[PDB]
Design a protein around this nucleic acid. Structure first.
Lengths: 108, 119, 146, 67, 83, 297
RNA sequence: CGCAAGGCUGAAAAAUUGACGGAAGGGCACCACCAGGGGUGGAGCCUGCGCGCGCGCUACACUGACAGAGCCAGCGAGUACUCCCUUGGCCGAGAGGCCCGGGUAAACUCUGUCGUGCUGAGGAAUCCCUAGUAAGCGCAAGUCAUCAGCUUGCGUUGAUUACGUCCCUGCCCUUUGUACACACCGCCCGUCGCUACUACCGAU
């Protein structure tokens, strides 16, 4: 049980460190750090597998009405060197009319 | 059901009825007659209609917009344009419903994807 | 041993053996990482003499240490003093008395003495979606990055 | 392995899939296409055949002759 | 020719597979070897027991083709390791 | 066409999930039918379910048909089992060697209806595309190490399973001279399978015996002169290819005509060769504790 | 617990449906013909299979070398990746960390400078190959089996010659069935078995 064990039965076992001749390579990854690494990789691969399923089973004739108010991801040919697959969003700025810029420049 | 269970014509017409309903897309399985007991349903027919099946295929966004688009006549099923919003799309014509020839909705999709070929 | 080149699963492991004869003896052996990743010695490596290819369970890191746990037999020594006390007898000393008498310090390895390990909190990089997949997936699930 | 092959060949049992007729369902007797109470159960079977003729006509006409 | 056809032809030559002879034909056979030839047939028509090259010899010298038995050699080596 | 392949694969996966739930219910319904015929008392949780009785009255007959074996299970092979001759093409890896191309020819000649295709510069999704575009039943890919083949990939189409296996002890047809070998007879081969007993063994038996065209069942027990043998020990299926004459009613002379393998499968995926992200059905569990003790198939 | 669990013994048929062929006529095949192409086999290296054998890799010159100019890809992102080992010196009571030494393409296009100079493209055989195929080229990955002496992808450049015929070598099949009109064909052949009946021969 738990009362049938001495304090030397309860005593913790210490963890060894990376050798000092090899400490420049980083920390020695043990089971806990390996579990963190494996959890992050399995999570990222699960998201990527779901994205690959969604890109495979895509209707080529789909029509949402946000397509008339968004700029598409395009291709590398149409966009150019600045091509990421992400749809570009708006930063909030807008082209500003001349009367309001006349007001702002009088204030400045 | 009321026929005896080891009957040849019962077994043959069970397979015929289940295959016919699964080919029309009403049932989702073809291995139970309780599907025709409590799964065949006027809502199953009405969701095999055309604006709901293109809502599911994401040709439109909502069934209201889909009924508006197939009343304006952008949607063909196969090779023939469909103006009736009650055309029951079966399971093998859900692979052939698409936009019409000179469609402005098709130009909108191609203009979004930046593949607007004007030829 | 120590990893030399690390691919997705197969890692080349360097400072463990000295020759392809020793690797051919220890072919198929259950090799293990300190972290817990299992693996198997697959094939001796030709051009650096003493390295080998071992296919692991998942990707190991260059900081890791790759161990192989063999069991070497130990035979006891066949020494026998009688403790003839009424006649007289030579008593073999203990190792502490030997070290204090003939003045040799006890062997102590600094890599073996336990230390406190400063672990930084593990933060990982965000998800990096490829460009072709990110341009091919549909509108409801398209990535929006300003 | 050679003796296993010889035993199967001699007391010949082979695990090849056999060519079945494509119309085993509708034509189970395999007739040739050239020159050629229980009454309650028979009446029930004929009623189901009549019902299925009507219902199959209605379902094919409602799917608009894609079937 | 095929292996099937040459096997049938060699067994017809050795008289193991031919037509059902009458008692008069058996009288002629008892009026007028085959295991020694059947050993050669069962060795020749099962050529994968032993390792052979396909090209034949590279340079023909004339002076007066099974080059190894891998099955028998592997069984012999395993018996040596058992011992 | 491609939308139809995707739609039919999705319908197949949904029907398989519904079959899982319906099997969980139909294990309870078979106790009610056996208790009705034999009169042994059954569990109260089964006998007091009104939905189960009300639906049991309609779904007797498929359980009786499955007991008699009159119907066949929902499978990717049961649609076209003995109706169509399965066409199958054998291909190499990208830049094959001469012994890999001769081995590809040899295992083409193993199947009487197969064809061989030169890879050259052929992207693997377009290979899958051309297979579905020409309605092939099976593709088989080959991988060599250095003039000796080390892997097969048997993929069933339109959406069927892959079996990837590694080859060992390959003795080619192209090593023995033409005086001793000859042109292999192309008759429809008999098949024998020895040692497959698990449902996974019957799975690999199905995806291996639906590569061959169906034999005419009128007099197949005595006619036909060519046999192909798949026999497994320690889940490494070993395959021979013999040709035989029946030299008497009690004896038979065999003659080894084709290549010898002992292929070991390491991956059976419910999805074709292009899908690297398909859900696996079985894979060779190395680096586990008792994965070497446990024998599958 | 009961049965299984007592040795005329001493290793190496079926057939009215069967056994084997022949002749004629078809179909197919880069394991066939025909037209071409490409390997291997010559020298060296080495995995593998049993000193030998092939499979890859490398070298072998007109398709040249040197210097410039211009212009092209696709698959690839796990807080993860590193080629050794050392002469010295720094800061190091000691273990270490430093510094300085030693061992997004190839291709292609255009323009010039020099000119065959151990500075030599593989015999008999044997095998493979018919369109984005043969062949050249690089780049990337290393996915529970296999694979670094390599494997598998990915793009780039992209031909000649067949695409006919069963004449050779073969393989499969017809001569029974499986549908009916027009239309055409018109009892394929041999050696035996088995069964039924008939009479014969000679011992008991």
């Amino acid at each position: 049980m738990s009362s049938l064990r001495h304090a030397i039965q309860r005593r913790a076992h210490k963890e060894r460190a990376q050798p000092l001749e090899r400490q420049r390579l980083g920390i020695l990854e043990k089971k806990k750090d390996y579990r963190l690494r494996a959890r992050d990789y399995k999570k990222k691969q699960a998201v990527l597998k779901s994205l690959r399923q969604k890109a495979a089973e895509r209707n080529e004739d789909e029509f949402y009405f946000g397509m008339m108010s968004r700029k598409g991801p395009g291709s590398a040919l149409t966009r150019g060197k600045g091509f990421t697959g992400t749809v570009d969003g708006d930063r909030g700025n807008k082209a500003l009319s001349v009367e309001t810029v006349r007001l702002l420049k009088t204030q400045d | 059901s009321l026929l005896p269970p080891d009957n040849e014509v019962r077994r043959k017409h069970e397979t015929l009825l289940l295959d016919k309903l699964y080919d029309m897309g009403i049932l989702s399985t073809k291995a139970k007659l309780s599907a025709v007991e409590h799964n065949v349903t006027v809502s199953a027919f009405a969701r095999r209609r055309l604006p709901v099946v293109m809502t599911r295929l994401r040709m439109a966004e909502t069934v209201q917009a889909a009924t508006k688009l197939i009343e304006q006549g952008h949607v063909r099923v196969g090779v023939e344009e469909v103006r009736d919003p009650a055309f029951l799309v079966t399971r093998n014509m859900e692979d052939f419903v698409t936009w019409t020839v000179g469609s402005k909705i098709k130009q909108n999709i191609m203009k979004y994807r930046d593949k607007l070929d004007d030829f | 041993g120590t990893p030399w080149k690390i691919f997705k699963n197969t890692a080349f492991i360097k400072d463990m053996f000295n020759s392809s004869l020793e690797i051919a003896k220890f072919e198929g052996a259950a090799i293990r990482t300190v972290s817990g990743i299992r693996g198997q010695i697959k094939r001796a490596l030709s051009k650096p003499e003493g390295y080998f290819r071992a296919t692991f369970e998942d990707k190991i890191l260059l900081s890791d240490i790759v161990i192989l746990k063999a069991w070497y037999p130990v035979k006891p020594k066949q020494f026998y003093n009688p403790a003839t006390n009424l006649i007289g007898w030579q008593s073999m000393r203990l190792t502490g008395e030997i070290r204090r008498a003939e003045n040799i310090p006890t062997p102590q390895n600094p890599n073996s003495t336990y230390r406190k390990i400063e672990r930084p909190e593990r933060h990982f990089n965000p998800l990096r979606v490829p460009k072709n997949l990110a341009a091919e997936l549909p509108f409801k699930s398209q990535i929006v990055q300003t | 392995i050679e003796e296993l092959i010889k035993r199967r060949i001699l007391a010949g049992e082979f695990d090849e899939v056999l060519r079945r007729r494509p119309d085993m369902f509708g034509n189970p007797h395999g007739v040739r296409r050239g020159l050629v109470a229980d009454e309650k159960l028979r009446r029930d079977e004929e009623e189901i055949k009549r019902m299925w003729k009507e219902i199959s006509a209605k379902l094919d006409a409602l799917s608009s002759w894609h079937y | 020719g095929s292996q099937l056809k040459r096997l049938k032809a060699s067994l017809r030559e050795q008289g193991l597979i031919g037509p059902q002879k009458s008692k008069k034909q058996k009288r002629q056979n008892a009026n007028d070897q085959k295991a020694e030839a059947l050993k050669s047939i069962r060795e020749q028509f099962n050529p994968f027991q032993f390792k052979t090259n396909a090209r034949g010899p590279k340079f023909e010298v004339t002076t007066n083709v099974i080059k190894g038995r891998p099955e028998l050699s592997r069984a012999r080596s395993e018996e040596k390791r058992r011992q | 066409m491609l939308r139809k392949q995707a739609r039919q694969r999705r319908d197949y996966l949904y029907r398989r999930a519904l079959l899982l739930r319906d099997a969980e219910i139909a294990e309870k319904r078979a106790k009610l039918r056996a208790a009705l015929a034999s009169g042994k008392p059954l569990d109260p949780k089964i006998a007091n379910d009104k939905e189960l009785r009300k639906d049991f009255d309609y779904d007797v007959s498929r359980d009786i048909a499955k007991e008699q074996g009159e119907i066949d299970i929902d499978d990717e092979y049961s649609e076209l089992s003995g109706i169509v001759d399965p066409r199958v093409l054998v291909t190499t890896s990208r830049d094959p060697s001469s012994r890999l191309m001769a081995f590809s020819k040899e295992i083409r000649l193993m199947f009487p209806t197969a064809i061989r295709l030169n890879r050259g510069n052929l992207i693997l999704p377009d290979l899958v595309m051309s297979a579905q575009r020409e309605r092939l039943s099976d593709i088989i890919l080959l991988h060599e190490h250095r003039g000796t083949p080390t892997a097969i990939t048997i993929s069933h189409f339109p959406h069927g399973p892959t079996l990837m296996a590694s080859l060992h002890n390959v003795v080619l047809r192209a090593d023995i001279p033409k005086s001793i070998k000859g042109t292999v007879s192309e008759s429809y081969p008999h098949l024998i399978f020895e040692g497959f007993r698990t449902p996974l063994g019957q799975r690999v038996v199905k995806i291996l015996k639906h590569l061959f065209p169906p034999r005419d069942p009128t007099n197949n027990a005595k006619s036909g002169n060519r046999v192909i043998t798949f026999v497994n020990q320690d889940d490494c299926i070993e395959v021979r290819h013999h040709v035989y004459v029946r030299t008497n009613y009690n004896s038979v002379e065999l003659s080894e005509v084709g290549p010898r393998f002992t292929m070991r499968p390491f991956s059976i995926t419910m999805g074709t060769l292009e899908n690297k992200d398909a859900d696996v059905e079985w894979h060779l569990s190395q680096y586990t504790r008792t994965g070497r003790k446990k024998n599958y198939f």
